[PDB]
Amino acid sequence: PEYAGPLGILQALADGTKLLFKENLLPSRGDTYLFSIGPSIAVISILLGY
Amino acid sequence: MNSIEFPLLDQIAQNSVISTTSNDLSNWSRLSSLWPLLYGTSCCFIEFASLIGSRFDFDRYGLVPRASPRQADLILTAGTVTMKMAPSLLRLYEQMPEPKYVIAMGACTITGGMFSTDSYSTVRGVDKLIPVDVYLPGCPPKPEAVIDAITKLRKKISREIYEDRIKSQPKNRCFTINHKFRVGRSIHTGNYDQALLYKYKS
Amino acid sequence: GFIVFIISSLAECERLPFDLPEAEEELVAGYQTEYSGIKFGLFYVASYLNLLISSLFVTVLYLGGWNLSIPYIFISEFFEINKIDGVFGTTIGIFITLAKTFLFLFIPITTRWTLPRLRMDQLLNLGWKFLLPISLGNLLLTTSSQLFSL
Amino acid sequence: EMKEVLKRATPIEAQVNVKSRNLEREYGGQWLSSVTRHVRIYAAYIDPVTCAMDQTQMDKLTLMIDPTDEFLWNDETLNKVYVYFEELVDHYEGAPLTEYTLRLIGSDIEHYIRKMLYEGEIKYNMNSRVLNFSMGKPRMK
Amino acid sequence: IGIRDFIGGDLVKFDLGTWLSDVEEHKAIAMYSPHEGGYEGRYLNRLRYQGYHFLDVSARGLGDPETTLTKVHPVCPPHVGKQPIARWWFPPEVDYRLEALPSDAKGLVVWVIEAKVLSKAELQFLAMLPSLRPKVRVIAECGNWRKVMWKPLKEIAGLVPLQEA
Amino acid sequence: VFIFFPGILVWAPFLNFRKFPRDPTMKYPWSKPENPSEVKGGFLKYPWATIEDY
Amino acid sequence: YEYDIFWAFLIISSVIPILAFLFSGILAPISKGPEKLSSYESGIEPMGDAWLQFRIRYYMFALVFVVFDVETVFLYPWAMSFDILGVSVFIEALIFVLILIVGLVYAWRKGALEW
Amino acid sequence: TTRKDLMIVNMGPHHPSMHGVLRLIVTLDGEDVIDCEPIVGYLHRGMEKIAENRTIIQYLPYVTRWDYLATMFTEAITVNGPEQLGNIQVPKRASYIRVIMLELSRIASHLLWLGPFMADIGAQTPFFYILRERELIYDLFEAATGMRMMHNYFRIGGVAADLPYGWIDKCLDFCDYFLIGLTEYQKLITRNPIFLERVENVGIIGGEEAINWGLSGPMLRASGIQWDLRKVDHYECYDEFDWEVQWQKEGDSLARYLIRIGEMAESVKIIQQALEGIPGGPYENLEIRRKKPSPAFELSKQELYVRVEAPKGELGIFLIGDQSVFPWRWKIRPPGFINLQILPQLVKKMKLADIMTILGSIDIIMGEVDR
Amino acid sequence: MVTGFINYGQQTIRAARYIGQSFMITLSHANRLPVTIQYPYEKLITSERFRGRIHFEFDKCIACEVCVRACPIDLPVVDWKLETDIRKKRLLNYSIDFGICIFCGNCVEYCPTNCLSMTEEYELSTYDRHELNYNQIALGRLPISITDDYTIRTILNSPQTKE
Amino acid sequence: MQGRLSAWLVKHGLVHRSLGFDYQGIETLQIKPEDWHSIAVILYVYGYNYLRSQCAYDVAPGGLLASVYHLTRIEYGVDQPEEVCIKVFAPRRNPRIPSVFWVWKSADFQERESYDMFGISYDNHPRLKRILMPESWIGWPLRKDYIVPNFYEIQDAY
Numbered sequence A: 001p002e003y004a005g006p007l008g009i010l011q012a013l014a015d016g017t018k019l020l021f022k023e024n025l026l027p028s029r030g031d032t033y034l035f036s037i038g039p040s041i042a043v044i045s046i047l048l049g050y
Numbered sequence B: 001m002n003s004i005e006f007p008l009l010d011q012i013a014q015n016s017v018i019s020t021t022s023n024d025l026s027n028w029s030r031l032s033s034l035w036p037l038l039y040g041t042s043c044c045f046i047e048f049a050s051l052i053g054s055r056f057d058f059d060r061y062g063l064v065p066r067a068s069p070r071q072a073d074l075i076l077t078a079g080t081v082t083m084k085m086a087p088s089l090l091r092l093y094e095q096m097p098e099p100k101y102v103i104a105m106g107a108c109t110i111t112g113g114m115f116s117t118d119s120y121s122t123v124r125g126v127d128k129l130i131p132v133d134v135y136l137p138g139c140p141p142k143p144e145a146v147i148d149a150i151t152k153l154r155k156k157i158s159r160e161i162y163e164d165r166i167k168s169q170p171k172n173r174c175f176t177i178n179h180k181f182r183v184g185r186s187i188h189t190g191n192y193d194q195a196l197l198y199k200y201k202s
Numbered sequence C: 001g002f003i004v005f006i007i008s009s010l011a012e013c014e015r016l017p018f019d020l021p022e023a024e025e026e027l028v029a030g031y032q033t034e035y036s037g038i039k040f041g042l043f044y045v046a047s048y049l050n051l052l053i054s055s056l057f058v059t060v061l062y063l064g065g066w067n068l069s070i071p072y073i074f075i076s077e078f079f080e081i082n083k084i085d086g087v088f089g090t091t092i093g094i095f096i097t098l099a100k101t102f103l104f105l106f107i108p109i110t111t112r113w114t115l116p117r118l119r120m121d122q123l124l125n126l127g128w129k130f131l132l133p134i135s136l137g138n139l140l141l142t143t144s145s146q147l148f149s150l
Numbered sequence D: 001e002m003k004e005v006l007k008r009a010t011p012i013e014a015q016v017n018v019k020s021r022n023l024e025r026e027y028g029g030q031w032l033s034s035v036t037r038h039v040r041i042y043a044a045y046i047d048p049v050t051c052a053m054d055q056t057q058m059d060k061l062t063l064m065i066d067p068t069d070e071f072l073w074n075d076e077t078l079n080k081v082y083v084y085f086e087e088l089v090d091h092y093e094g095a096p097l098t099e100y101t102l103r104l105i106g107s108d109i110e111h112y113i114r115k116m117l118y119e120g121e122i123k124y125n126m127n128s129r130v131l132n133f134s135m136g137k138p139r140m141k
Numbered sequence E: 001i002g003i004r005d006f007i008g009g010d011l012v013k014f015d016l017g018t019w020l021s022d023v024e025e026h027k028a029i030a031m032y033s034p035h036e037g038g039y040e041g042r043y044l045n046r047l048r049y050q051g052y053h054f055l056d057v058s059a060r061g062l063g064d065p066e067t068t069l070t071k072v073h074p075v076c077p078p079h080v081g082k083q084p085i086a087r088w089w090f091p092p093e094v095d096y097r098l099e100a101l102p103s104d105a106k107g108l109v110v111w112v113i114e115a116k117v118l119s120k121a122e123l124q125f126l127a128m129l130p131s132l133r134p135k136v137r138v139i140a141e142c143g144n145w146r147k148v149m150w151k152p153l154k155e156i157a158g159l160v161p162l163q164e165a
Numbered sequence F: 001v002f003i004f005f006p007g008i009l010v011w012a013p014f015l016n017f018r019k020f021p022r023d024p025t026m027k028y029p030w031s032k033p034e035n036p037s038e039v040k041g042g043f044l045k046y047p048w049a050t051i052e053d054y
Numbered sequence G: 001y002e003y004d005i006f007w008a009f010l011i012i013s014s015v016i017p018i019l020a021f022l023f024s025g026i027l028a029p030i031s032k033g034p035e036k037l038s039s040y041e042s043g044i045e046p047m048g049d050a051w052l053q054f055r056i057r058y059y060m061f062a063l064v065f066v067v068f069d070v071e072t073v074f075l076y077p078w079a080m081s082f083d084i085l086g087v088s089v090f091i092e093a094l095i096f097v098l099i100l101i102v103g104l105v106y107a108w109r110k111g112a113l114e115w
Numbered sequence H: 001t002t003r004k005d006l007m008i009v010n011m012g013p014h015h016p017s018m019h020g021v022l023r024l025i026v027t028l029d030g031e032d033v034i035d036c037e038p039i040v041g042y043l044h045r046g047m048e049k050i051a052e053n054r055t056i057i058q059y060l061p062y063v064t065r066w067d068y069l070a071t072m073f074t075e076a077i078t079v080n081g082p083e084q085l086g087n088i089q090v091p092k093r094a095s096y097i098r099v100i101m102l103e104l105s106r107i108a109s110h111l112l113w114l115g116p117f118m119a120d121i122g123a124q125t126p127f128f129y130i131l132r133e134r135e136l137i138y139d140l141f142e143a144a145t146g147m148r149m150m151h152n153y154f155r156i157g158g159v160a161a162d163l164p165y166g167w168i169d170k171c172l173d174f175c176d177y178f179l180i181g182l183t184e185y186q187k188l189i190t191r192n193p194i195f196l197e198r199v200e201n202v203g204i205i206g207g208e209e210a211i212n213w214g215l216s217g218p219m220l221r222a223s224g225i226q227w228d229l230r231k232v233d234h235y236e237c238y239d240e241f242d243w244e245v246q247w248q249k250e251g252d253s254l255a256r257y258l259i260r261i262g263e264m265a266e267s268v269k270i271i272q273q274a275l276e277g278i279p280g281g282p283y284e285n286l287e288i289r290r291k292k293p294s295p296a297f298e299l300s301k302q303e304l305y306v307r308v309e310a311p312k313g314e315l316g317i318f319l320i321g322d323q324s325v326f327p328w329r330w331k332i333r334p335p336g337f338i339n340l341q342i343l344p345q346l347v348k349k350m351k352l353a354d355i356m357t358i359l360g361s362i363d364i365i366m367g368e369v370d371r
Numbered sequence I: 001m002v003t004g005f006i007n008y009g010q011q012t013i014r015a016a017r018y019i020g021q022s023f024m025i026t027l028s029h030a031n032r033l034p035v036t037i038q039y040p041y042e043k044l045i046t047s048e049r050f051r052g053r054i055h056f057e058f059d060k061c062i063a064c065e066v067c068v069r070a071c072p073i074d075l076p077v078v079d080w081k082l083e084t085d086i087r088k089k090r091l092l093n094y095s096i097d098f099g100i101c102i103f104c105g106n107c108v109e110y111c112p113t114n115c116l117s118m119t120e121e122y123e124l125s126t127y128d129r130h131e132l133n134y135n136q137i138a139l140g141r142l143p144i145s146i147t148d149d150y151t152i153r154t155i156l157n158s159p160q161t162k163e
Numbered sequence J: 001m002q003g004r005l006s007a008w009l010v011k012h013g014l015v016h017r018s019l020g021f022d023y024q025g026i027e028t029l030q031i032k033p034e035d036w037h038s039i040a041v042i043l044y045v046y047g048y049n050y051l052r053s054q055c056a057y058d059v060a061p062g063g064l065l066a067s068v069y070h071l072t073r074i075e076y077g078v079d080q081p082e083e084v085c086i087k088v089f090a091p092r093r094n095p096r097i098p099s100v101f102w103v104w105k106s107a108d109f110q111e112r113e114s115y116d117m118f119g120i121s122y123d124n125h126p127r128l129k130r131i132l133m134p135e136s137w138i139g140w141p142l143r144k145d146y147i148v149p150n151f152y153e154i155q156d157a158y
């Protein structure tokens, strides 16, 4: 990464803000609640180790 | 005369600090992280591979290839789209989340190229299937030309406002009737080379 | 225990060669296939946070943590570093911890881009037939050596 | 004079609480549909209010014209396209539900749409996401 | 050179009022931008905020912009040997877009990308276009630079002596 | 960089590292070189270049 | 207290995904469509909904893992009290480790850990 | 266990491991491949139909679009079909240039096989490592022919133009650098334990099965069969150079990998020998070289079959003329299209993650499988 | 029985050695200079026979239409009329659409008057497809050489070897 | 002149017809479709290990459909292998040719191509279906009198 910031420093910040501004897509065939709960549980249980 | 017409719309918004700078920062963030679909069909994908490699780097613009459509912003259509592939291409484009951008790379993706004259299955341009933002001429376009097309796409992306969002959602009109056709099961059922030795039938 | 902890933490962080649930070449994106927007970012953060916490636990459990001194040798630099106390001592400890964490951040980031990835059956074989008996033997050796302390 | 386009294409009665369903194991793996930038013919029941598509209802053909708006559509033009679609479906009676038949139907429907555009019935939609004129640039006669 | 060169080329600068004043005073503006692009939208965005509608014109395939933009022009669609040669006539692009704009629009802005490929006289006409059409603003990328800088297009085309900045 | 990134994340938006023009006379993008021969054109790359060609 | 920080940290860690979801909901647009909501199956139209039904002989390591988790949980308090007490707890936990080893050997020889 | 337990997954046109738009309908019983059905034709542009109603000087750009990695082999077969029909001789310098270009294209094709193969195994760095030198091959081709790919360099009764000044030394320096690069590749990959354990015992093919299935090239040569069409048919000048047919006894994917590495080395030896003994004289045939209306090559009224040893196997052209500029029939025998049909037999009773290894072992690109 | 453990030992150390060998081979590339061409701040100088955008000379065209026949798709459009005073073909319009062009080089090779040439002008991307229909004025524009752009570093692929 | 394979067949009393040689002198024989399934096994018995290519072509529009087989031997120690071309002709109204998939497996895909492009139906082929064209397609594209039915996405990009 060279162009997102001086030496690509702002590349990951750009990725995060893009994912923030990206449309939240839910599956029609599956279950919404498990879909929303899964990654939250993973990130909570990983953050709790700090 | 195939004329053009502007529909009726309201005044935009007007803002001082919050909305304008938020929109500018959102545009800048979507500039530097245009993740391609890793959609490859034909020979042009090789040059696409040459833009993933070391001599011309995808990573300088961001532009990390993501396999799943849900994680892809840009679809960079490389290759001829046959009749057998075009519905799959349109699904893949539709499954990508908004906002999404299309670059038609290669002469076969703009107008059909060499196959525009005698091929009985080549779709003459994906503009008949997907809305294309930037057209990239050339049979195997040089990877620098691909970067130039991506630069022009960034030039158009940075010009976006919030109003363009309501230009992007589909109108979603439908019409349903009975067809009285003949319903038949799929020919390709997945049964292949299983109990083949008992299929002689002399 | 150091090697087995490295391999087990790399498997739990799902870094290559243990990237099987998210293996892009076998499945399109794994469990992240249908995930778009902020949730994919969450499942990305969580992965990198797991990598960071694994590196921190490597430098805490097996390396010396914030400690950097050689009491058995007349190392002037290390003695002068350990002689500092207060705000500056805590700052130097944070610096040392971050450097030791960055070593075992550099190693797995390289590991992803160097080795090929494992297979599911071979992953199970490595986990259950090469790492577990070896860890049991390491625990037995640790207990036998700790018998001398009491 | 008169009313004109008096056919007034009658859709099937609207269902309620329709939930999205995938195709079955035996019927899956096939397209049973014709999708293209201006026309989507699906052998499914798609409702527009909740965006739910039931693909197990293979006895219904759902037609979606111009999802990414490139033309400005009035209700009369929609009715014209819909009566043409009904006539085309009734014309192909006895044909299989394969992708080939639906692609042919979509091809004639898009030829009709291009004829309407060049006759002045519809105009290109400005304030669209793109301006590429897939049916041809503005030209004079 | 350094110091100022290596100091912030950030996109939060207060040059925007000067940019709008220049684009209102000097109707035709030559613009120079970063090579990787994307730092032009901050300046075109505020023009689009005032009601201006953009017409994107590529200068490579422009083809004698006088009759391409301000006149009805003949173009031949590409036959591939299956059709006889047909001569189509296209409406004047900028005037068609002008007469087809909504009444509330402030005007039309012609964004001429890759204007370096045009000759001197083509740039002269592109600079003098707003004199003929009052409600048209001309923006032409005449090159690339480390930072966004704009000049009057008449100065670049040679109608006005190039004053030192 | 890993240690001091909280301090680099502030300075990075207020710094640009864009590469400079080949001639050290181009004050403006519309400026013309005095003599277009003293520039060095044809920088090589890794198989056949040294550190002087960057 | 050493555990109110734990509760506050847990509350903050649970709040963070809620904040991310709320920010995405108020920032990202919605443009839902019937083609977009279809399940992704590499372009082709998915057949019957998911579902694999693995073999038992593959997933027989989980029954070993349930027992081994309990054994490794039971080994921790002995290690915490290894220094306060002496060789008595060494003899006590030696049988535990030996039974663990014998169970691992049985699972290895019977083919439970084979794929 | 017949149904509702067997998962039918369409690992289809859009898949990173699927080279191009190959589709596999794979039936899995808990990560075990019961069987797989290959669906191809997502890139079928009808090139055999476009082969008619096109002259040879018009059809030559179309030729490089099958096997776009090894373009010179397709160009060679297209220009040596009709020149054999018309009994056109090729000058020795043109033949040597053709041999050099064919061997360079074989090197490039083996490289850009090794890349996606190791990517499918799991290593992404070798892709960039091969691209570092395939860019040098592209530079040589663009210096000589004028483009990186789709060269349009081969012509009937010769070549388009002579080699530019300063090309021999550049190619020799490339060979010297590429030998070192190949040694680095073999040091990094060949004995790696993960690579071996992913590759060592997958896709065992018997020699008799390889012969019956119609396999050719590194697929057939990796089953104990020393069958190379360069030494059997005495193509061009391959009888003058010292080289060895690379074949291995075991049938697994490791044998195919070793065969392709050895073929790259032998190819480099062939470029070195050819450049050391390059002849002089003309390159275009002066007999055929002759505002006025220009006719194309009128094919004679007889059938013909011509073969070439492509890096993927045997590439063939069956040509039926009609005493006119447009050929009556132009059938393409693609090596990948015939090598692909053994895949369901190999992946049967294997595992899901082994499909990538098996498919990367076979040099399949989808632009040549369909036409 | 002991020999099995010994063989397990020697077949484990070998794997560790080869993993370290892969690590060393990969990390030895950190001491080597990058090969990346930093487009668009750096541009690679094209070859002497690179096939790019067509350049057309209007005065040298005779409307003989052999460039159309030599094209694989008959792409070039040559609208001409006969000047009855001299009975020579007068050219009215010449157009090549670069959305269908494949840059094969047949037109520039089989043109008898040699009015068609290949330039180095790649990067012809446009936002609109129909803007790629270059007429005789757009084709007649001189290409912009990257050696004349002094804000970039022109990269040469190989040493000039002209000595 | 009589070829080696033709002389062997007339020695073994197998009906056929010699159509001559190509430009390389490879023998070309014509086999009746009713005898082709019995003659293919005898061809392998002769020693033709390798089915190099299977092809189909149109003799004339509105005329016969010809299916072409190229055969050779792969063996150790043979300098010049023996190659033979063999053509089986079927009527256009209902083309039926026995499949050699049970003799050489290499025909497995190739005959399907001959079914997909020209419509020649192969009897004992166990998986005879369209391979290159879409599976729901109606018509055989490579026949000389085929006409494309005016699909929208095949027409000119307007």
Ligand code: SF4
Pocket (backbone or CB within 6 Å): B042, B043, B044, B078, B079, B080, B106, B107, B108, B109, B113, B114, B138, B139, B140, H065
């Ligand atoms: S431009 Fe078209 S024909 Fe040429 S390689 Fe690309 S996809 Fe194939």
Ligand code: SF4
Pocket (backbone or CB within 6 Å): I060, I061, I062, I063, I064, I065, I066, I067, I068, I078, I110, I111, I112, I113, I114, I115, I116
């Ligand atoms: S071949 Fe040359 S002279 Fe003849 S019509 Fe074409 S461009 Fe004109």
Ligand code: SF4
Pocket (backbone or CB within 6 Å): I067, I070, I071, I072, I073, I074, I075, I076, I096, I100, I101, I102, I103, I104, I105, I106, I107, I108
């Ligand atoms: S370059 Fe080739 S494709 Fe393009 S116009 Fe000329 S002959 Fe036609």
